[PDB]
Amino acid sequence: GGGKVQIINKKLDLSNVQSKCGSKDNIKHVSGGGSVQIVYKPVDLSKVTSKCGSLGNIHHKPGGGQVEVKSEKLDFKDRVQSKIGSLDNITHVP
């Protein structure tokens, strides 16, 4: 009869991290220092008129809509340890 000692330390990380971002989009970021006119899909006798006069001390600084998609998995100071002080395995079979 032999004395068996077994110690095991496993760590499996089955990780799947994804970050998808689709956009079917029209027009989006349109910016005009003076007048801006937008006409989406006019039909038949669709009269659209804009009038504007003079253009003086104008500041126009559009900061816009930032889109951000993220997906993180983080392990900070993870530890899987096994401290076996003073191990001994004696077999004595006369």
Add this chain to the structure above:
Amino acid sequence: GGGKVQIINKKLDLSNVQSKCGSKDNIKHVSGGGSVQIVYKPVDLSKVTSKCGSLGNIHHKPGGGQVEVKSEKLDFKDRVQSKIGSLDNITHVP
């Protein structure tokens, strides 16, 4: 008869982190220093008129609608330990 000692320390992380962001969108961020005119899908004799006069000391700083999608899984100072002080496994089979 052999003395068996077994120690096991496992840690399985079956993780799935996702972050999806779709947008089917029209027009979105439209900015005009003077007049802005938008006409979506006019039909038949749809008269639309805008008039504006003069343009002086104008500031126009549109900060807009930021979109953010996130998905985190974090493990801070995780610990799976097994402290076995002074282990001993003796077999004595005359």
Add this chain to the structure above:
Amino acid sequence: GGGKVQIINKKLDLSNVQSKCGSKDNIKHVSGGGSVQIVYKPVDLSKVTSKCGSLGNIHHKPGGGQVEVKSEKLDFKDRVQSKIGSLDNITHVP
């Protein structure tokens, strides 16, 4: 009967990190120092008119919509250890 001692320290990292970003888009970032006119898919007798006069001290600094997609998996100070102080394996079979 022989005394067996076994120590195992495994660490499996089955990782899958992805970051997809599609965009079927029209027009997007359009910027005009004076007037901006956009007409999407006009049909039939779709009269669209814009008028503007004069263009003075104009600043026009469009900061726009930054899109960012990210996906991180990070392991900071990960540790899978096995400290076996003073190991001994004696076999005594007269």
